[PDB]
Design a binder for this molecule. Structure first.
Ligand code: SF4
Ligand code: SF4
Lengths: 170, 373, 176, 170
């Protein structure tokens, strides 16, 4: 109930913020892509200081890396899931970095940039070898264009010291 | 029954001779300060609802008294703003005259700030010398325009009285060369002794992020790391053909905000020496003959204008709006010291000792006729 | 842009360097002994008013540019300037069309608490023969009216001058 | 010229920001009333840290206290004049305070509230006797509903120790 009042207070301060309240405290809503940067500090200054991992799912059918952003409360205990939808090409993989408002996203953006796709403009720790050294940095292994068991075969010739065929699935 | 029993509230009201006319109520803790709120407005003449009733030309003489130490910087900003809404053709001669009186009133205000600092820092000799050498600048202004202070000079177009001539322009060369030889005897009494340097060291530490966003616009945030001089950034009068050099420090304690004003005095006196060897060419002192007559009935076309100009304490702006008649619809004179010794002073006295409440009060050049307006 | 120092402005403190402020123990002290060494003020110092009674047309052009609203008009239609509310800004000089409102260097004017000496601040300013009260009568630079005898119902003010004419005239009516 | 590029960069980050560039550096524009609070930190974070006096003109014909807000630059030297238009009744004299972004408006709002009209919600130094003690606080003397020379007569009986009528105008 109280989350409905909280999201009603948020919707007064923002128009493009269609808030669905799950079970009691799972306040999930989607925003457009290049509007969250002028929006996440509305969410910071209202009641949600702490930011969890910038987890980003992929979709090959509709090409878009839906970067959902996890926020959390400290006075009530709820957990926002504000999410965007940015295009899927590496040319169009652009997203403005949230470092001026959250120092939590100094390191979350490094993992989501080194794992798959997205490039964040106004940050300094970008080409640093954070994780996945060469030759794993040269291709992004956490999207759906990279399939396992055809790169592992090109990296290791045999997957069984023993016999017949323990390298397929199912 | 005295309901605090812990913190005695001495407060420097008007009759104190350290603060000029603004009371700072200090919640003292033994010998430090734990809460320093100020009560300004012992001098509130009013200028919003008081300068709205006079015509456009005669609203100079009423507007001089918004800042007492500089009796030319308040008129030369309103004269710059009514210059804009009408759009005159102020000539080279009027521009040069207004330039030189805007810089000689600035060295007068620096000399007055030195004398006001020394009257509350104990040492009287740097006070008596500073007032003595301000008096010959006053007696040099009196040849030009009128009285000592509040010389109603710069009407919205041009000036009112031109130079007398070689009796005057040779005299300014004499007093400027004299005071440039004299200024090396102010250092040994005010800026070279190991008392003052040990008295103003580390008191009122102003941060770098604490000056630019706070309301501070003067030369005192320039002692903190900030590159902003309104004479250098957007030159207005005959400034671009001067090539002076501005001081910037990375410090921000109180004596950093005093040495910068001393160096500003040195380079401003070098400006007045550099401006004089140019000399003004010919031209009129007024601007135009036909669009000035019937001096009360002076219908200005509507619009608005902002101007802002360097002062001894703070780059302080004017805001005139014209309804379209012979009345300024609202002339706002932003005082330099509104958030420059009222709000930034509150987070500057917290922790400071009682001996450095007056010295901090003068290390920002607090002039009480600017908070009220 | 054109930052002057790197540490050039900040100087070094010093023990016994203030003794160079002690140099003026023997030079001539720079003061003026005002009783009685006079100063001789500027040739165009802004002072008091010297209306000319033969060029004044009563058009009240000065009335509307006085910033302090003291140039109110009388009849016999000249103005009386009161220095109660006057800032000596001399906007009443260069706005008077005929030229019948001058200003001469006279500023010293001290009156006491009694009302009979405070009627001294309501004067219809006299002709520029008052310049023969600035010179040729003991050049003291003081207000040469020095007492005023108003009289109710017989309104005839008397500027009893320094030794000259008593300058009687009647005043009836004010404003326009 | 460069101010036109600066205001073009500002108009990318804000829609309701119709920017007119005066002579070289007098970038003046009007915004709606209850939208500047989500706007002044766009102006702060771009290039304009320092805030001058919140000067507020009045208009009796169209009833609105046009609170113009003076901003300034430090790297170029320009001076913004972002302005609103809030209603004129004391009931409707409401304006959200800019203290979370500017500590410059801790004291400017005190003078504009004690002089005329406007009340600022989220601030603590509101009913403090800043200036204009009793009985001048009980009526706002800087609007156009308060006329001089009919309050001064009710506060001081005579305005001339001397004679006839030196208390009118013109
Ligand atoms: S002397 Fe100055 S203030 Fe007095 S009436 Fe004349 S112009 Fe006005
Ligand atoms: S001095 Fe000038 S304005 Fe005054 S009454 Fe005489 S003519 Fe008129």
């Amino acid at each position: 109930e109280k989350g409905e009042e909280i999201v009603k207070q948020i919707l007064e301060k923002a128009p493009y913020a269609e808030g669905k309240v799950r079970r009691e405290r799972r306040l999930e809503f989607r925003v457009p892509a290049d509007k969250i940067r002028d929006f996440l500090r509305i969410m910071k200054e209202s009641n949600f200081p702490l930011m969890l991992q910038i987890t980003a799912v992929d979709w090959p059918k509709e090409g878009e890396i839906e970067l959902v952003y996890h926020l959390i409360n400290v006075e009530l205990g709820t957990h926002a899931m504000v999410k965007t939808r940015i295009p899927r090409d590496l040319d169009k993989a652009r997203m403005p970095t949230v470092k001026d408002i959250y120092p939590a996203a100094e390191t979350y953006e490094r993992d989501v940039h080194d794992f798959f796709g997205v490039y964040f403009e106004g940050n300094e720790k970008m080409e640093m070898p954070w994780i996945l050294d060469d030759p794993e940095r040269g291709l992004y292994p956490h999207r759906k264009d990279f399939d396992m068991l055809a790169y592992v075969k090109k990296k290791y010739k045999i997957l069984d010291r023993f016999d017949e065929d323990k390298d397929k699935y199912v | 029954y005295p309901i605090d029993k812990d913190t005695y509230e001495l407060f420097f009201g008007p009759q104190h001779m350290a603060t000029e006319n603004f009371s700072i109520i200090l919640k003292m803790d033994g010998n430090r300060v734990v809460k320093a709120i100020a009560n300004p407005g012992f001098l509130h003449r009013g200028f919003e609802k008081l300068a709205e009733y006079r015509p456009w030309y005669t609203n100079i003489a009423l507007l001089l008294r918004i800042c007492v130490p500089e009796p030319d910087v308040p008129e030369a900003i309103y004269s710059m703003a009514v210059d804009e809404i009408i759009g005159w053709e102020v000539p080279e001669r009027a521009q040069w005259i207004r330039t030189l009186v805007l810089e000689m009133a600035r060295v007068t205000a620096y000399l007055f700030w030195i004398m006001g600092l020394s009257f509350k820092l104990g040492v009287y000799t740097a006070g008596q010398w500073a007032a003595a050498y301000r008096e010959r600048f006053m007696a040099l202004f009196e040849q030009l325009t009128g009285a000592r202070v509040y010389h109603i000079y710069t009407i919205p177009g041009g000036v009112r009285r031109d130079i007398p001539g070689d009796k005057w322009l040779r005299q300014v060369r004499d007093t400027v060369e004299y005071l440039k030889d004299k200024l090396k005897d102010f250092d040994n009494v005010l800026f070279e002794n190991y008392i003052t340097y040990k008295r103003l060291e580390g008191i009122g530490v102003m941060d770098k992020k604490f000056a630019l966003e706070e309301g501070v616009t003067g030369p005192n945030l320039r002692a903190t790391g900030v590159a902003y001089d309104v004479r250098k950034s957007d030159p207005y009068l005959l400034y671009p053909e001067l090539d002076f050099e501005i001081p910037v420090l990375k410090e921000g304690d109180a004596l950093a905000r005093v040495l910068v004003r001393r160096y500003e005095l040195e380079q401003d006196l070098y400006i007045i020496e550099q401006l004089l060897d140019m000399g003004p060419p010919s031209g009129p002192y007024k601007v135009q003959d036909p669009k000035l007559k019937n001096l009360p009935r002076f219908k200005v076309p509507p619009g608005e204008a902002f101007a802002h100009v360097e002062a001894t304490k703070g780059d302080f702006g004017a805001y005139v709006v014209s309804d379209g008649g012979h009345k300024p619809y609202r002339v706002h004179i932003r005082g330099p010291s509104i958030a420059h010794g009222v709000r930034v002073l509150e987070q500057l006295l917290v922790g400071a000792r009682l001996a450095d409440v007056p010295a901090i009060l003068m290390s920002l050049d607090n002039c009480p006729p600017d908070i009220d307006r | 842009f054109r930052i002057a120092p790197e540490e050039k402005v900040k100087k070094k403190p010093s023990f016994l360097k203030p003794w160079f402020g002690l140099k003026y123990l023997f030079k001539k002290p720079v003061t003026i002994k005002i009783p009685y060494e006079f100063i001789e003020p500027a040739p165009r110092y802004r002072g008091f008013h010297t209306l000319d009674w033969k060029k004044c047309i009563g058009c009240n052009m000065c009335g509307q540019i006085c910033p302090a609203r003291a140039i109110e008009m009388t009849w016999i239609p000249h103005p009386k300037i009161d220095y109660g509310r006057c800032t000596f800004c001399q906007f009443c000089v260069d706005v008077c069309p005929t030229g019948a409102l001058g200003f001469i260097e006279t500023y010293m004017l001290t009156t006491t608490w009694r009302e009979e000496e405070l009627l001294l601040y309501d004067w219809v300013p006299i002709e520029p023969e008052k310049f023969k009260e600035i010179q040729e009568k003991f050049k003291d630079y003081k207000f040469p009216v020095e007492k005023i005898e108003f009289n109710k119902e017989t309104k005839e003010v008397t500027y009893y001058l320094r030794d000259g004419t008593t300058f009687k005239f009647k005043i009836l009516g004010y404003g326009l």
